[PDB]
Amino acid sequence: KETAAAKFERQHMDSSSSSNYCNQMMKSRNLTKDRCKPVNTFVHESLADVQAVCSQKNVACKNGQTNCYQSYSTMSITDCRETGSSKYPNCAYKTTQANKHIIVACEGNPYVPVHFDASV
């Protein structure tokens, strides 16, 4: 079973944009298999910097758990949002670049992000 941490890296880490960035990324990260994942965020900071968020500002998660953390600094991210006319299997996304604080849920040993809660 893919760990939650590994799933977080697959769905949300791209440390490495074109208007087609989201179309290609959502495909390459297996987020267009079976369904078009409607909304997704990729974070372009180093894995180390994102993992460090687990030592930054403790905040409540959307689901009410208390293991969420807001990055002290803004981070370079890309929001991928499925277009109003996107129809599986031809998943189409609008790519929007931004610099925002990220909120992630952290868990496990090592204590790392396991869920992307929001950008603010």
Cite the active site residues. 12, 115
Task: Tell me how far CA of residue 99 lies from CA of 24, 39, 52, 102, 119, in angstroms.
Answer: 21, 17, 17, 9, 9
The reply, when asked if residue 29 is annotated as ligand binding, is no
The reply, when asked if residue 38 is annotated as ligand binding, is yes
Closest by CA position to 83, among listed 75, 73, 94, 99: 94
The reply, when asked if residue 87 is annotated as ligand binding, is no
The reply, when asked if residue 63 is annotated as ligand binding, is no
The reply, when asked if residue 62 is annotated as ligand binding, is yes
Q: What angle do CA 2, 3, 9 make, to 5 degrees?
A: 90
Q: Give the whole-angstrom CA distance, residue 21 versus residue 5.
A: 23
**What sign does the dihedral 102-106-112-115 (CA atoms) show?**
negative
Q: Enumerate the known binding-site residues.
A: 7, 10, 37-41, 62, 81
Q: Enumerate the known binding-site residues for substrate.
A: 7, 10, 37-41, 62, 81
